[PDB]
Amino acid sequence: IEEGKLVIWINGDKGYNGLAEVGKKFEKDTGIKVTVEHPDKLEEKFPQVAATGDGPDIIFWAHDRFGGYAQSGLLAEITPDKAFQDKLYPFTWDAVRYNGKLIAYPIAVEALSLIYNKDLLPNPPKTWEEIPALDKELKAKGKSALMFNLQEPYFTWPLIAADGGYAFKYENGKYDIKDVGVDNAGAKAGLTFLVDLIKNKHMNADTDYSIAEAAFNKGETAMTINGPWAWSNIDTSKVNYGVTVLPTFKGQPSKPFVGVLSAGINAASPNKELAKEFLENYLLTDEGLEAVNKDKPLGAVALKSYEEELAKDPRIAATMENAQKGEIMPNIPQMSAFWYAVRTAVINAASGRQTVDEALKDAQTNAAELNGPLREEIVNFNCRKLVASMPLFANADPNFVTAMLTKLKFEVFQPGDYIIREGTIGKKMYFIQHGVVSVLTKGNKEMKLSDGSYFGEICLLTRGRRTASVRADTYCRLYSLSVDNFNEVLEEYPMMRRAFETVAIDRLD
Ligand SMILES: OC[C@H]1O[C@H](O[C@H]2[C@H](O)[C@@H](O)[C@@H](O)O[C@@H]2CO)[C@H](O)[C@@H](O)[C@@H]1O
């Protein structure tokens, strides 16, 4: 971030080129440059980087992650006046409330639908249960019935929820965080049906977003499950598609988790006023949303004036029908733990790492018990110890140490793994969070290092070989810090760079 410009983050499946057009209009009027970026794992990156001088001015995501960001102090309260508020649907404003405060601008309402190829399947099935029979019929003609993203639990959730699965029980206007529904009869039946699809070769566990998109848009599968954003690429592929009600499971509708694409203002931004002006006066207008919608459809927009037009589209009416059979996602801080829990369970069940019963038992405990803030805190202090213990960093500015912590990468090694091999060239030093290693120098004396220690640091000043091998003696958990990332932070703190250069200037004598 820098004062006088806007950096916006939005997910790579959304209309980021269209948003950049809105930004080009903004720059033309104010001289303020707008850069739109779509980094991978943006929703996880944002809370890591936002405090530490990095991060976008504006973050776009579904509202479910914003309670967490709000809890962490990473979002500015927004202050639209009543007239502006009246422009958007009251339920969209509700979705972005935390402690009664508005913490983001709602943009669009998202739900998943069944997308079907009308040439391959003129009458799409009404039930999940008839998909195996349909796939066998299609397999004989070199096709498949259904492919969709099995790596993201968002896509499998409607099935899980259909017969009674739920995230957190809603009662008397509030979520009971101790009452998780991911291990109940309904959730187990849903995921069992999905795993049986996999086991009987009607779907593949490795299927991700790209695979399913490419299969449906090339005409290889009769159906997919996706949201409005995906419709552009299907239009471009020329497939004759319909958008309809998701299939029923055990006679019960699929229950997609409804998301409200929302735009938050990073509390670290020096551009909060410019961010408000862009969001209120440029993006949230008929012209602004249209530019984004034209690139990748937004869904049912929060802006009433524009939604009046979009609601005439039967694809948007199918989206809202699915949405009404679903549930608005909670925005509570525990949602991150929930998603992490269900993601691992679905991946483990589908692959056969665990049974459905085992995977979901562990998901229940993870979603209910896991304390993100507490675990984050413990992880951050321990990393801070490791980095600040090293002689080089022993008297450095605490913010320098803090920026450096964000660069650390988690690595694991098995007994007998060489972390560093003598004669090779590395670009990383290592800190030992947990484990024992041997430092071996050809023939010689071993030296054993353990929890708290470090090694490989000479790559910070060498551009040269590894002069010793380092072998894991037990299971090791390490953090690595690369010379590039070290330099990058060292450039952000010029007083430290000068100190370290004067050190190196004397190390030549
Ligand atoms: O898979 C869990 C994931 O679900 C939701 O993410 C959606 C997102 O809302 C959509 O806009 C679209 O981009 O696809 C994502 C699924 O890959 C939740 O918003 C997210 O927090 C959660 O991790």
Residue numbers in the entry: -367 to 0, 494 to 634
Lines quoted from the article behind this entry:
However, a unique conformation of the unliganded (apo) CNBD from HCN channels has been recalcitrant to crystallization, with the only reported crystal of the apo form containing a conformation essentially identical to the ligand-bound form (less than 1 Å RMSD difference between the two). The crystallized construct lacks the first three α-helices of the C-linker, making it unable to tetramerize. The majority of the crystal contacts are formed by MBP, which is significantly more ordered as compared to the CNBD (mean B-factors for MBP = 22.9 Å2, and CNBD = 43.2 Å2), making it unlikely that crystal packing interactions contribute significantly to the observed structure of the HCN2 CNBD. The large-scale structural changes between apo and holo structures involve both N- and C-terminal α-helical fragments that undergo a rigid body rotation around hinges that correspond to the points where they emerge out of the rigid β-roll cage. The core β-roll structure is essentially invariant to the presence of ligand. The coordinated movement of N- and C-terminal domains is necessitated by the fact that motion of the C-helix toward cAMP introduces numerous steric clashes with the apo conformation of the N-terminal domain.
Although binding of cyclic nucleotides is known to enhance HCN voltage-dependent activation, the mechanisms that underlie this regulation remain unclear. (A) HCN2 channel subunit transmembrane topology is homologous to canonical voltage-gated potassium channel subunits with the exception of a CNBD following the pore lining S6 helix. To resolve ambiguity in current ensemble-based models of cyclic nucleotide association, we dissected the intrinsic binding dynamics at single molecules to reveal that cAMP binding involves multiple conformational transitions: an initial binding step that is appreciably slower than expected for a diffusion-limited encounter complex, partly due to selection of the ‘receptive’ conformation, and a subsequent ligand-induced isomerization of the CNBD.
